[PDB]
């Protein structure tokens, strides 16, 4: 197995996947690495299995259909993996914890949002459809763009949103377009 966490790229107390060479900190993995379970398979492995069991699940889909899906176990897992892929980028630090807003010439968002809040919401099964999760994720970046206005720091929202969107299209097999 790898000797660094797959998400944060640091050493520490790592839990190793039994079916692939990845390792994780307990709370870097999503869901948090399960107490017992030998063997243990990480979220990457669990996602690969879904695909292998139903190869047609990789055919293209319309976003509007994906968003209306109920959060059954496989969709819950896919949103967990998508959230994990965002944490995998170091720039996610900016969006992880609860923000505060006191900048001359700007007003804070009506509905603040952040990664750890989305993580808790998924853990608590608060989303009934994929749309709920995706709306909260996109709200993170939209709030950032609006608040930071013409400051060049707005770009960090564009950057992390692009990671989210690419991974959303991959994980949910959105039909490719120009």
Name the 3-class secondary structure at 15: strand
Query: Between 120 and 128, whose beta carbon lies closer to Zn ion?
Result: 120
Q: Can you tell me the distance from the alpha carbon of 9 to that of 131, in angstroms, rounded to the nearest whole number? A: 30
Q: Report cis status (omega within 30 of 0) of the bond before 39.
A: yes
Restricted to residues 105-134, the positions that interact with Zn ion (CB under 5 A) are none
Span interacting with Zn ion, options 48-56, 70-78, 93-101, 137-145, rule CB under 5 A: 48-56
Q: How many residues bind Zn ion (CB under 5 A)?
A: 12
16 binds Zn ion (CB under 5 A): no
Query: 123: which 2 tokens?
Result: 């853990």
Q: Can you tell me the distance from the alpha carbon of 161 to that of 115, in angstroms, rounded to the nearest whole number? A: 12
Nearest Cα residue to 47 out of 13, 15, 84:
84
Q: Which of 1, 2, 8, 26 binds Zn ion (CB under 5 A)?
A: 8
Span interacting with Zn ion, options 54-62, 82-90, 117-125, 132-140, rule CB under 5 A: 54-62
50 binds Zn ion (CB under 5 A): no
């Amino acid at each position: 197995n790898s000797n660094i966490c797959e998400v944060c790229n640091k050493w520490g107390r790592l839990f190793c996947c039994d079916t692939c060479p990845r390792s994780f900190h307990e709370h870097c993995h999503i869901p948090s690495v399960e107490a017992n379970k030998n063997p243990w398979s990480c979220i990457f492995c669990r996602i690969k299995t879904i695909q292998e069991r139903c190869p047609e699940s990789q055919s293209g889909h319309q976003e509007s259909e994906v968003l209306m899906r109920q959060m059954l176990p496989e969709e819950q897992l896919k949103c967990e993996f998508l959230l994990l892929k965002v944490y995998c980028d170091s720039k996610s630090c900016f969006f992880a914890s609860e923000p505060y807003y006191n900048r001359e010439g700007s007003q804070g968002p009506q509905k603040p949002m952040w990664l750890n809040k989305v993580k808790t919401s998924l853990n608590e099964q608060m989303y009934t459809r994929v749309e709920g999760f995706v709306q909260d994720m996109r709200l993170i970046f939209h709030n950032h763009k609006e608040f930071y206005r013409e400051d060049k720091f707005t770009r960090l929202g564009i950057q992390v949103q692009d990671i989210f969107e690419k991974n959303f299209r991959n994980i949910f097999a959105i039909q490719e377009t120009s």
